[PDB]
Swiss-Prot record:
<feature type="transmembrane region" description="Helical; Name=6">
    <location>
        <begin position="313"/>
        <end position="333"/>
    </location>
</feature>
<dbReference type="GO" id="GO:0051781">
    <property type="term" value="P:positive regulation of cell division"/>
</dbReference>
<dbReference type="GO" id="GO:0009410">
    <property type="term" value="P:response to xenobiotic stimulus"/>
</dbReference>
<keyword id="KW-0325">Glycoprotein</keyword>
<feature type="binding site">
    <location>
        <position position="97"/>
    </location>
    <ligand>
        <name>ergotamine</name>
    </ligand>
</feature>
<dbReference type="GO" id="GO:0007208">
    <property type="term" value="P:phospholipase C-activating serotonin receptor signaling pathway"/>
</dbReference>
<feature type="short sequence motif" description="[DE]RFG motif; may stabilize a conformation that preferentially activates signaling via beta-arrestin family members">
    <location>
        <begin position="171"/>
        <end position="174"/>
    </location>
</feature>
<dbReference type="GO" id="GO:0001819">
    <property type="term" value="P:positive regulation of cytokine production"/>
</dbReference>
<dbReference type="GO" id="GO:0003007">
    <property type="term" value="P:heart morphogenesis"/>
</dbReference>
<keyword id="KW-0675">Receptor</keyword>
<dbReference type="GO" id="GO:0050795">
    <property type="term" value="P:regulation of behavior"/>
</dbReference>
<dbReference type="GO" id="GO:0001965">
    <property type="term" value="F:G-protein alpha-subunit binding"/>
</dbReference>
<feature type="transmembrane region" description="Helical; Name=7">
    <location>
        <begin position="349"/>
        <end position="370"/>
    </location>
</feature>
<keyword id="KW-0564">Palmitate</keyword>
<feature type="transmembrane region" description="Helical; Name=4">
    <location>
        <begin position="131"/>
        <end position="151"/>
    </location>
</feature>
<keyword id="KW-0807">Transducer</keyword>
<keyword id="KW-1003">Cell membrane</keyword>
Length: 388
């Protein structure tokens, strides 16, 4: 039917405006936004340490996406029918695509776990070797999920060697489009949900112990004040010392120093109590209050509010990262799991959602680092080409 053949002639139209849109809105902000973070970690000597190395690994992964994956994925937009590049590049590009796309997700998952354990066990920290182990393991996972695509390969015809037409066929790669999405997306998703609620419980548990310490400390002061006996000053001071140390152990090693001072005073106080002079010791315990006010009280709200806000913004940005991948993977999963649905339009939907996921992974590290003043005014000097 010529009235339909002409319609397919219109279907294979010109789609340069969409390609220009993707260059302007996604690829350029990806390469630039990631090179900014890499420059920030590389140049700023004050930014160099354990966590930023992992963050830089993530930025490298996303930069590699925006450098090798997306420009070829464009050529597929324009040259819709047949794969233009050589035959080897179809498994090469697909492998790189899955590899990096998985690497970003698992990077975020590992960062979530780290940010949680840092709240749980703050005193147990995080060398360079730890970060190296983490980078290696994450990239090993990404390779392990990505390797079936180059191992299996794209079907070829002895008749038509040229017409490869790169696509993950449902018939050929069905199990991979299922279990690869399960191992690559939904598993770290569930992990991050678990660590989310665990982080809520961890923060709410840390906040209570600080209050108990506070009025543990405050109560015993009242005990020292009304102490007619000598022994109790030793007991009250001992328990105040324990409470002070316990409260100080909630933060990695400046109101925190006020605990050291406090303990010191307490020691001297229970020296007088050990000498017998209770009336002279209670007089110094009556001025433990100055240290208790100038440092401890301001320390309590600072820790809580800081960890609260940081975990909050981290949760939000990570949630918005994972939200923009959902269409791709729910479409990819159902595409396997539906013999009733139309496969053609279901493939077009993937061909659109890939760019939502692409822009989600591309701008993620920059967005995450922009909530840090040091990174911000490093970027400001970089976009003004000032450097150092
Ligand atoms: C050809 C299409 C894909 C667009 C071209 C992309 C490249 C060449 C462009 C797009 C955005 C550009 C980057 C934008 C931001 C910076 C920060 C600056 O401190 C160094 C240059 C650098 C890193 C630019 C280098 C060139 C750049 C990466
Ligand atoms: C729409 C054009 C088609 C052509 O077949 N391209 C794809 O389907 C690519 C395949 C992907 C994939 C498949 C299976 C598991 C996966 C992934 C990814 C990560 N994980 C864990 C990345 C995702 N890529 C971005 C797109
Ligand atoms: C209804 C339950 C569904 C979603 C709840 C979880 C929504 C948020 C999921 C991502 C949150 C996250 O990843 O948090 C990491 C945590 O902050 C690291 O310490
Ligand atoms: C360590 C890396 C862990 C490996 C995770 C890999 C599992 C992804 C699922 C692999 C399933 C292959 C599907 C076979 C096929 O249909 O071609």
């Amino acid at each position: 039917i010529p009235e339909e053949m002409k319609q397919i002639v219109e279907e294979q139209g010109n789609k340069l405006h969409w390609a220009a849109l993707l260059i302007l809105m996604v690829i350029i902000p990806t390469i630039g936004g990631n090179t900014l973070v890499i420059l920030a970690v590389s140049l700023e000597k004050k930014l160099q340490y354990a966590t930023n190395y992992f963050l830089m690994s993530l930025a490298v992964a996303d930069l590699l996406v925006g450098l090798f994956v997306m420009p070829i994925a464009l050529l597929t937009i324009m040259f819709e029918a047949m794969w233009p590049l050589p035959l080897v590049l179809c498994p090469a590009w697909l492998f790189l695509d899955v590899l990096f796309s998985t690497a970003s997700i698992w990077h975020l998952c590992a960062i979530s776990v780290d940010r949680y354990i840092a709240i749980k066990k703050p005193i147990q920290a995080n060398s360079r070797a730890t970060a190296f182990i983490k980078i290696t393991v994450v990239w090993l996972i990404s390779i392990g999920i990505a390797i079936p695509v180059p191992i299996k390969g794209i079907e070829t015809d002895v008749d038509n060697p040229n017409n490869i037409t790169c696509v993950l066929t449902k018939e050929r790669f069905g199990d991979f489009m299922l279990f690869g999405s399960l191992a690559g997306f939904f598993t770290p998703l569930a992990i991050m949900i678990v660590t989310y609620f665990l982080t809520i419980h961890a923060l709410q548990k840390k906040a209570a112990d600080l209050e108990d310490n506070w009025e543990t400390l405050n109560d015993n002061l009242k005990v020292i004040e009304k102490a007619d006996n000598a022994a109790q000053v030793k007991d009250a001071l001992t328990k105040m010392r324990a409470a002070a140390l316990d409260a100080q152990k909630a933060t990695p090693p400046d109101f925190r120093h006020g605990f050291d001072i406090l303990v010191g005073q307490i020691d001297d106080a229970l020296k007088l109590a050990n000498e017998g002079k209770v009336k002279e010791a209670q007089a110094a315990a009556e001025q433990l209050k100055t240290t208790r006010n100038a440092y401890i009280q301001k320390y309590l709200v600072q820790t809580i509010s800081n960890e609260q806000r940081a975990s909050k913004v981290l949760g939000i940005v990570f949630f918005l990262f994972l939200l923009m991948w959902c269409p791709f993977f729910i479409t990819n999963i159902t595409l396997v799991l539906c013999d009733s649905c139309n496969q053609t339009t279901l493939q077009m939907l993937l061909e659109i959602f890939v760019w939502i996921g692409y822009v989600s992974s591309g701008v993620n590290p920059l967005v995450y680092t922009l909530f840090n003043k040091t990174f911000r005014d490093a970027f400001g000097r970089y976009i003004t080409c000032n450097y150092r």
